[PDB]
Amino acid sequence: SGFRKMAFPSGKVEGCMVQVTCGTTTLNGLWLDDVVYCPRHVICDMLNPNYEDLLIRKSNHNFLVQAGNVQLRVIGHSMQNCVLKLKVDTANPKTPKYKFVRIQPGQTFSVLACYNGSPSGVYQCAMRPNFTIKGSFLNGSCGSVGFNIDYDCVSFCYMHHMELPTGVHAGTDLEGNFYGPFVDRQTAQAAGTDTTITVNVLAWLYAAVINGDRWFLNRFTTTLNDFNLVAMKYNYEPLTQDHVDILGPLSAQTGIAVLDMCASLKELLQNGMNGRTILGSALLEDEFTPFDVVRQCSGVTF
Amino acid sequence: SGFRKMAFPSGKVEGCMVQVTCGTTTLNGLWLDDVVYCPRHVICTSEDMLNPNYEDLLIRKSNHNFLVQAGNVQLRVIGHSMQNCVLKLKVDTANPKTPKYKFVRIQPGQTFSVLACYNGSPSGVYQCAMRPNFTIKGSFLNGSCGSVGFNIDYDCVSFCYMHHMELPTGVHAGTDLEGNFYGPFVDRQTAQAAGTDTTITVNVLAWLYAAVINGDRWFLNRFTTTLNDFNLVAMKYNYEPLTQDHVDILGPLSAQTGIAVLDMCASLKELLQNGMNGRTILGSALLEDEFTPFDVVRQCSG
């Protein structure tokens, strides 16, 4: 029993974390095979930077890459979108089975927060619909990475680049493409209005039911069209047929059809929780995907 | 900025997890140097549930009765001994991935990370706190026994919890790594109930300081309180008494924010009376009590 905000075991990623220093900037790099990936803004105050330009001046020995107390030597440097690729002369013997994947808003992943190439914390979060992440990052955390694990395979999906003025965070995939309408320079940038991830709330309500927490269930069911009218009123993401289909396993396990659970969610959006809680929370959690709920409520291992 | 329920990187513990089997029972073990630690109730049968005589059961065991598997490698048990409620399996191989480590027994309100495992394989990592009633609100399924809770000091893993059982309310009970249960619990299927839980007041106050550090002030007020008046109120909300130790411990956060501890206590009093009025603190509509003062300083300041 129990339901916790659960991250993937971070060991496969810890063995990949290195420190990258260049000029006065120090941040984290991801050492996979013989390449260290890191944010391109480690490059050498021009506030509308010309990254390629500044990069050609750079010598390989300008990039001080520190793997534990062992210093790697850079033998090449190239650039892909907002990520710098530093070719090193040694393949990481700890390189896990891995892929680079780009995730969709609403999908969850684990962040290994690092400082000076040293892992210091791991937490689970979701890519918000406004493409930010509500993370926990201090100065020096840039280059910390987000990931999922499937079996023995690490899917790297996120690299941290910056904090927005509201305190939420922005970054790229491992191919250097930003999540959301952000750029890696000093300019006025703001997170858009965020919305709640409806399918994840429903998944979490199924988790609550599996854990015996049932007071919000009601006899009623609604339509996809009626619910999305209510959802848009409450700044909830639209629920699609694909979302219903993905919730299928939880619907079958619980006896609660998705549109049946939607009538519960609607009631709750319109009436509140009335001082009651669900899985120890007085808010509707939206950072558990349907797969997270199945995975934590069945004990899948890595 | 930002505040997340954050676990320690689990890799140093992942490299220690093994599978231990006696007869029909399989659970997790902790392999450090040449000793595997696991809950002694792995030697129980379906008939030894209510009143096992572990000394009698263990004396009947021979080393080859213990099937210990590390990955695909079966370890060979060369000796066994019992220390309180943990079994210590001496094996012929020292774990080459043994971190610097130490066994620490923690006090209620202390937090730690749990690496939930099944069949010796890590499933996920989450953060917990030892409740005042000596349970933990974990996320465990069948086969999770022997999963451990831990903290990390620089590079030293402090093992503080080993999972043994789930109580009827769905909360969890376990031992330190010397085999001593936290709380009045025993490794028997005899009827056992968690005492009424209470809120870890000092942790809530730390979290309110974390909220202030992260820019939120709406819950502050112009009042202070005496320590005794605060505890008289808090006890009526099933909050733990706040001691002078706790006041001392909140000193650094008081200094960093400019809000005296007894001043913040007056804010907590008011929040207890009023609730949040549709507002949140650090993204929560409830008062969070599973962040210690040490946690807050580490995550908010470094």
Swiss-Prot record, chain A:
<feature type="active site" description="Nucleophile; for 3CL-PRO activity">
    <location>
        <position position="142"/>
    </location>
</feature>
<feature type="topological domain" description="Cytoplasmic">
    <location>
        <begin position="1"/>
        <end position="302"/>
    </location>
</feature>
<comment type="function">
    <text>Cleaves the C-terminus of replicase polyprotein at 11 sites. Recognizes substrates containing the core sequence [ILMVF]-Q-|-[SGACN]. Cleaves and inactivates human TRMT1, preventing tRNA guanine(26)-dimethylation of tRNAs. May cleave human NLRP1 in lung epithelial cells, thereby activating the NLRP1 inflammasome pathway. May cleave human GSDMD, triggering alternative GSDME-mediated epithelial cell death upon activation of the NLRP1 inflammasome, which may enhance the release interleukins 1B, 6, 16 and 18. Also able to bind an ADP-ribose-1''-phosphate (ADRP).</text>
</comment>
<feature type="cross-link" description="Glycyl lysine isopeptide (Lys-Gly) (interchain with G-Cter in ubiquitin)">
    <location>
        <position position="5"/>
    </location>
</feature>
<feature type="active site" description="For 3CL-PRO activity">
    <location>
        <position position="41"/>
    </location>
</feature>
<feature type="domain" description="Peptidase C30">
    <location>
        <begin position="1"/>
        <end position="302"/>
    </location>
</feature>
<comment type="subunit">
    <text>3CL-PRO exists as monomer and homodimer. Only the homodimer shows catalytic activity. Interacts with host FBXO22; this interaction promotes the proteasomal degradation of nsp5.</text>
</comment>
<feature type="cross-link" description="Glycyl lysine isopeptide (Lys-Gly) (interchain with G-Cter in ubiquitin)">
    <location>
        <position position="87"/>
    </location>
</feature>
<protein>
    <recommendedName>
        <fullName>3C-like proteinase nsp5</fullName>
    </recommendedName>
</protein>
UniProtKB/Swiss-Prot annotation, chain B:
<protein>
    <recommendedName>
        <fullName>3C-like proteinase nsp5</fullName>
    </recommendedName>
</protein>
<comment type="function">
    <text>Cleaves the C-terminus of replicase polyprotein at 11 sites. Recognizes substrates containing the core sequence [ILMVF]-Q-|-[SGACN]. Cleaves and inactivates human TRMT1, preventing tRNA guanine(26)-dimethylation of tRNAs. May cleave human NLRP1 in lung epithelial cells, thereby activating the NLRP1 inflammasome pathway. May cleave human GSDMD, triggering alternative GSDME-mediated epithelial cell death upon activation of the NLRP1 inflammasome, which may enhance the release interleukins 1B, 6, 16 and 18. Also able to bind an ADP-ribose-1''-phosphate (ADRP).</text>
</comment>
<feature type="cross-link" description="Glycyl lysine isopeptide (Lys-Gly) (interchain with G-Cter in ubiquitin)">
    <location>
        <position position="90"/>
    </location>
</feature>
<feature type="cross-link" description="Glycyl lysine isopeptide (Lys-Gly) (interchain with G-Cter in ubiquitin)">
    <location>
        <position position="5"/>
    </location>
</feature>
<feature type="active site" description="Nucleophile; for 3CL-PRO activity">
    <location>
        <position position="145"/>
    </location>
</feature>
<feature type="domain" description="Peptidase C30">
    <location>
        <begin position="1"/>
        <end position="302"/>
    </location>
</feature>
<feature type="topological domain" description="Cytoplasmic">
    <location>
        <begin position="1"/>
        <end position="302"/>
    </location>
</feature>
<feature type="active site" description="For 3CL-PRO activity">
    <location>
        <position position="41"/>
    </location>
</feature>
<comment type="subunit">
    <text>3CL-PRO exists as monomer and homodimer. Only the homodimer shows catalytic activity. Interacts with host FBXO22; this interaction promotes the proteasomal degradation of nsp5.</text>
</comment>
